[PDB]
């Protein structure tokens, strides 16, 4: 990857780590007695970037027995640009009503947790079962907002990061690995851009 | 797979076929010249059954090194006996605009082709630069209303199949392979 200053996790590392909080997602939820029809996991994919992490993570929640209902949303913070805009969009809410549901919010990073926070607010109200979240990424430090994520695949230092789902002006996330975008990349584009 | 009559396609045969299918691709887009940001190939992927599909193929075009821009679109019925042509409730369309882009609607079944005929036609207005359509399985004898997919990684027969995407009631979606449900499964949960 010309673009890339370095490569945080390979497709490998990435596959390995999401089988072993499948894991822990299957252990954790198995008092609850989850069945497919009559009481799945409703997972809750937040679009465009978690598509990838919810396509690998769903065929690892099954590879233990875990039936799961997918639900797709839309919501919108950062645009094309680099940081948060602190306003966050819903382009597309839940097909079914999640009352009474085991409910898992599946998300590609938190940074300043405005998005999550966002989500998680809005689902609560909606008295689910249980609401947890499984994030794939964590800025830890780049909190706007205080959120505890249920599940973390990695924690990452504060640097734009690609792959995997995640983009930089809706470039690269069809990359198998997650990698660091070189500034000088995001700098010239920035420029062109604005 | 104890609900299942028979395997079609394991995980691995799936994921290989992908990869065919992703080279022909690259091979045909070479001379429209796609780049990143400003000409990409702008994938539309018609949730929710193409979420897998989509997830396996943009990564086996990246491996070919065809840039793209991922769209996902979410459509819905009006109501029961409403619409002859396969019209559609668009619930959530494309980001960005499609007009002077190369463009290719994913989709992971074509079978009577009523809703992807009317997407296709519904987005060809649009002007983009060109547009076709790629499809996971193609079940070729169903069609009520005239349908070819430029790109089709399997055609299969008359059966009901679930897994990689496909559903049966939101059931099943999750499986890494393809199978068929069983036929008396399926009757009666129908019905039900
Ligand atoms: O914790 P926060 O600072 O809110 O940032 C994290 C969110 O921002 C990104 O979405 P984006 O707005 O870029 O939309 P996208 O998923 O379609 O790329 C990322 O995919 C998360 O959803
Ligand atoms: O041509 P027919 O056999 O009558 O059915 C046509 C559509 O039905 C399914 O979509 P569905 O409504 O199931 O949406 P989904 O992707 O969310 O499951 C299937 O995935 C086709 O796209
Ligand atoms: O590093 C990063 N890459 C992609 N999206 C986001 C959002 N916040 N931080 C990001
Ligand atoms: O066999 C099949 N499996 C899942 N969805 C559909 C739609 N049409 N035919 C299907
Ligand atoms: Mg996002
Ligand atoms: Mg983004
Ligand atoms: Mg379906």
Redesign the pocket.
Same mark, same amino acid.
């Given at each position: 990857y010309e673009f890339a200053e370095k490569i945080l996790f390979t497709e490998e590392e990435i596959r390995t780590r999401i089988k072993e909080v499948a894991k822990r997602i299957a252990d954790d939820y198995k008092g609850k007695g989850l069945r497919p029809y009559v009481n799945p996991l409703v997972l809750i994919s937040? &679009?465009?970037?978690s598509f990838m992490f919810t396509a690998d993570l769903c065929r690892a929640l099954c590879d233990f027995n875990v039936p799961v209902r997918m639900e797709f949303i839309c919501?919108?913070?950062?645009?094309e640009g680099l940081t948060?805009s602190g306003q966050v969009r819903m382009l597309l809410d839940t097909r079914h009503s999640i009352e009474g549901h085991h409910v898992l919010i599946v998300?590609?990073?938190?940074?300043?947790? &405005?998005? &999550?926070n966002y989500l998680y607010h809005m689902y609560f109200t909606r008295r689910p079962a249980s609401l947890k979240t499984v994030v794939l990424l964590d800025k830890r430090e780049?909190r706007r907002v205080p959120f505890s994520a249920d599940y973390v695949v990695a924690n990452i230092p504060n640097a734009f990061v690609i792959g995997y789902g995640?983009?930089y002006d809706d470039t690269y996330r069809e990359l198998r690995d997650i990698v660091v975008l070189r500034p000088e990349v995001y700098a010239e584009r920035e420029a062109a851009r604005g």
């Open positions: 937040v &679009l465009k970037g919501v919108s913070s950062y645009g948060s998300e590609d990073i938190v940074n300043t947790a &405005l998005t &999550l780049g995640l983009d």
